[PDB]
């Protein structure tokens, strides 16, 4: 694969977005989630443990938490933390909100972490950036064991929403190290408040210089498609470029008028 | 004034957040504030009418906003956006929450834009970033009009929690402007989001660059007092740089290890 052929990617099938991990280290992933009988309706991979002893970081989108966690308990109560009363509790209101996490608990010989969180509040700010502390999760390459298609339907407009918020915060001239960089800031305290982001946080350089073909994937096909947003380097350097290749970043420019910035912020999700 | 003596101020007096603008503008500003009848307890200037036709943007943290709001639309009731109903209808909830705005209102012959929030929820957010909306207000160059030395304790433990972020962000060596460049990306989405941000809002770069002075007098003591930093600079250099010259950015070196960076993360107030 090169840098061109990345260019091209159908973004109508959200080609860009099916991002697989090794054959061997992916099956091994769905041996862990396929381990758990609650239905899970989106399996999202992370972290250390899937870009590569290590912890391996996981999210678990589903129909309604309440039940989910029912069956989790009756399969694995080892995972929880429970507590134990002198009389003859809370039912509901310790798992019915936010993402409920269930850290350094052994699979299948993985120590896995495992975040379960309400399908319908991930696709709400998916769409309508409520608090964008689950959207700027998927802004980053992740990988996507279970409900593949369902998924990059709703991610589609938050990728391209963040190419956006970059193109608005990065001037005539910049570079897609700018670029990459700019929108995992946009993130980064938010992947923190969440306890996404690896347990000590890593520098924003690191971030997107070992991921750097991931992100070229995500983000080059809507540069390629956004109007205005030209590449300098020939198609010559661009056919024979690795993706992974952190040796030359590619420069961009784009147009700036009034009327560029303003279609630009009028069409993301957090303008009343 | 020089760049090596922003390093020695006075950090126990706030002196790196003392931004007084042109005394001719600063008696035009506090003309603006002291029209107002109801009790302003803090009123903070900000934007492109603060930092040089234009529209001069400002805060108002209030003891309460229901009984301030009563006092202001007895006195300005032009500034508001009224209903009449014809049956003998919200009362409170329409002020007892968030920032409410008032845009393109003279007051004293210039067009302002002022909001109206609790300075309780205000102080809230400068403490433990329960959003960060409005702590990130605030780690940028702001001027303060009215209650000055009592804001200025409350906002010295977000400044210098916002430069720890940067520091966790940036990696062995960086330059200032990396530094303020980072900062700002932290507050840009929470500032379109409250509309405190430009009515347009405006590129990274370009907001750092037009505010050297300013950024340099904030966070440059802060650099200086905070151990394991170090100016790579010269102090010959430091004394012969005028602090909005753009021509040079000093850059820096930081000790990063795994207790330096435990010590940065869980001396932030976002983590249980």
Chains 1, 2 share one sequence.
């Not at 697989?20 to 309706?41: G, R, S």
């Not at 309400?118 to 309508?128: I, Q």
């Not at 409900?147 to 190419?163: Q, V």
């Not at 498609?225 to 380097?233: L, W």
């Amino acid at each position: 694969c090169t840098v061109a052929q990345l260019l091209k990617q159908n973004l109508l099938t959200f080609e860009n977005q099916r991002i697989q991990p090794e054959e061997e280290l992916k099956e091994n992933l769905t041996k862990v989630v396929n381990y758990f009988q609650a239905p899970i309706d989106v399996a999202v991979g992370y972290g250390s443990g899937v870009f590569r002893n290590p912890m391996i970081d996981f999210i678990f989108q589903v129909e309604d938490p309440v039940k989910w966690h029912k069956i989790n308990l009756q399969q694995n109560p080892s995972h929880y933390s429970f507590v134990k009363n002198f009389g003859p509790s809370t039912l509901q209101e310790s798992f019915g909100t936010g993402v409920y996490y269930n850290t350094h608990v052994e699979v299948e010989g993985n120590i896995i972490k495992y975040g379960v969180t309400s399908k319908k509040d991930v696709y709400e700010d998916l769409k309508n950036w409520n608090t964008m502390y689950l959207a700027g999760r998927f802004q980053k390459p992740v990988v996507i064991l279970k409900g593949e298609d369902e998924f990059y339907k709703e991610n589609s407009y938050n990728l391209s929403s963040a190419l956006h918020v970059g193109l608005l915060m990065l001037a005539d001239r910049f570079t897609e190290f700018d670029l990459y960089k700019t929108i995992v800031s946009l993130s980064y305290l938010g992947d923190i408040r969440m306890s996404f982001a690896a347990e000590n946080p890593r520098k924003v350089e690191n971030i997107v210089s070992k991921q750097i073909a991931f992100f070229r994937k995500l983000y080059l096909p809507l540069l390629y498609a956004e109007p205005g947003v030209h590449f300098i380097e020939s198609s010559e350097v661009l056919k024979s470029m690795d993706p992974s290749d952190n040796s030359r970043y590619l420069s961009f420019h784009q147009n700036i008028t009034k009327d560029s910035i303003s279609r630009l912020l009028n069409g993301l999700p957090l303008n009343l």
